[PDB]
Design an enzyme around this catalytic site. Structure first.
Site, short mmCIF file in Angstrom:
data_model
loop_
_atom_site.label_atom_id
_atom_site.label_comp_id
_atom_site.label_asym_id
_atom_site.label_seq_id
_atom_site.Cartn_x
_atom_site.Cartn_y
_atom_site.Cartn_z
N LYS B 38 19.38 15.23 22.27
CA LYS B 38 18.35 16.04 21.63
C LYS B 38 17.46 16.61 22.73
CE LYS B 38 15.18 13.77 19.37
NZ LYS B 38 13.92 14.11 20.07
N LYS B 68 11.75 22.09 16.02
CA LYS B 68 10.85 21.96 14.87
C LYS B 68 10.41 23.35 14.41
CE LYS B 68 9.28 17.35 16.17
NZ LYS B 68 9.91 17.34 17.51
N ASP B 71 8.35 28.88 11.38
CA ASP B 71 7.85 30.24 11.26
C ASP B 71 8.26 30.85 9.92
OD1 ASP B 71 7.01 32.02 14.12
OD2 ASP B 71 6.99 32.98 12.14
N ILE B 72 8.05 32.15 9.78
CA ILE B 72 8.41 32.86 8.56
C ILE B 72 9.93 33.01 8.55
CG2 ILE B 72 6.23 34.09 8.58
CD1 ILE B 72 7.64 36.53 9.64
N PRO B 73 10.52 33.26 7.38
CA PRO B 73 11.98 33.42 7.28
C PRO B 73 12.66 34.29 8.33
CG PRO B 73 11.08 33.27 5.11
CD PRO B 73 9.89 33.40 6.05
N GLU B 74 12.20 35.53 8.49
CA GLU B 74 12.84 36.42 9.46
C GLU B 74 12.83 35.88 10.88
OE1 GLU B 74 11.83 40.68 9.32
OE2 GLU B 74 12.15 40.72 11.49
N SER B 123 5.21 10.83 12.71
CA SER B 123 4.47 9.57 12.75
C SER B 123 3.30 9.48 13.72
CB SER B 123 5.45 8.43 13.04
OG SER B 123 6.13 8.64 14.27
N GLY B 175 18.57 -2.31 14.94
CA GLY B 175 18.59 -3.39 13.97
C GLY B 175 18.20 -2.93 12.57
N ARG B 188 12.45 7.31 26.20
CA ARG B 188 11.90 6.61 27.36
C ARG B 188 12.66 5.36 27.79
NH1 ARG B 188 7.90 9.09 28.63
NH2 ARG B 188 6.32 10.17 27.37
#
Lengths: 204, 204
Positions: B38, B68, B71-74, B123, B175, B188
């Protein structure tokens, strides 16, 4: 207001084109009318962050990075630092992730002498699901945090925002509009140029 | 589940380093244990989007762009298209902006054969202001939209999310965790490597 950004002709160009050649051509053609350009991820991810400095050097314009930062504090800090290092004068940040995420951006802007714009609300269809209902509180959060620059969304909504942030705060939004906002943001009506820009300015 | 992504050893590396040299070194050193990485804006904005293809070619790993998108659709469409064009296998998108903004991402993923992960909740401290209260509704919105991949945040919160999205959906979390999530995300504890990764895997 002397302590706030001065946008030439109260008109900000929303440069949403993704092609460097097209983006540069349009901006240069309107530099005599506009000194503030808002660039977003489409252009930057496609051409590289170096394009920010290119805009500033070739046209001497102020660059607002329309990134709508919405990550955790540590990541927000890094995004802001990288963006300001690339030359951006200001960055647009989301308020929905909370106060700490916004403050992380404010901290870097403070250290580097740059600016943070808080996006209080969006106006696309799905915005009514969660954003519309949190807009007033997000604006109030910004005020309580000392945020001085805001991006607003509906005429009556712009009026409500101005009420919350005060008469001193700097507000930009996409005659009526300029009664509340300090500058208007125009995109397609220009890049889709010199004549169009001249007309809008003459219109205000 | 056959229709969902297979993450090697159920362990995803969160490569948040901003230095290309450091980022490449760590990832290569753990490739025998992890096949899914990621990457976020800090690294991409600092080194360029070309680094995505570099990771995939040098290590043959799957890349999830932790952008993440909010924004707007376009604009969401353009961000996704640019990110997938750069080689990303998947992209993480915010749900707070609403259903149309999420669908814009789903449309591009459909056309290019890639994947969209819906971020249902965060979180960090400020998340309780607006995100925590909208988490369940955002998850339900994703389900109603056919979203198959989710990023979750508190053990009991992961249980709630798994309940909403069903047993079939793919869920990843930072776990006990693997009782609900299909894969865990570690940062980390690894990039701050081969021995660390091996231990975590041997652990579960």
């Amino acid at each position: 207001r002397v302590d706030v950004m001065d946008v030439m002709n109260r008109l900000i160009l929303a440069m949403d084109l993704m092609n460097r050649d097209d983006a540069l051509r349009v901006t240069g053609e309107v530099r005599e009318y506009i000194d503030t350009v808002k660039i977003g991820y489409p252009l930057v991810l496609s051409e590289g962050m170096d394009i920010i400095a290119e805009f500033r050097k070739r046209f001497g314009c102020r660059i607002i990075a329309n990134f709508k930062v919405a990550d955790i504090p540590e990541t927000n800090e890094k995004i802001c630092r990288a963006t300001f290092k690339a030359g951006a004068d200001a960055i647009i940040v989301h308020g929905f992730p909370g106060a700490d995420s916004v403050r992380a951006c404010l901290n870097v802007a403070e250290e580097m002498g740059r600016e943070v714009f808080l996006l209080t609300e969006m106006s696309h269809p799905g915005a009514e699901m969660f954003i519309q209902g949190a807009a007033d509180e997000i604006a109030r959060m910004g005020v309580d945090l000392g945020v001085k620059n805001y991006v607003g969304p509906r005429p009556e909504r712009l009026s409500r925002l101005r009420e919350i942030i005060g008469q001193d705060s700097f507000l930009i939004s996409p005659g009526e509009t300029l009664r509340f906002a300090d500058a208007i943001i125009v995109g397609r009506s220009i890049y889709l140029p010199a004549a169009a820009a001249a007309g809008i300015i003459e219109s205000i």
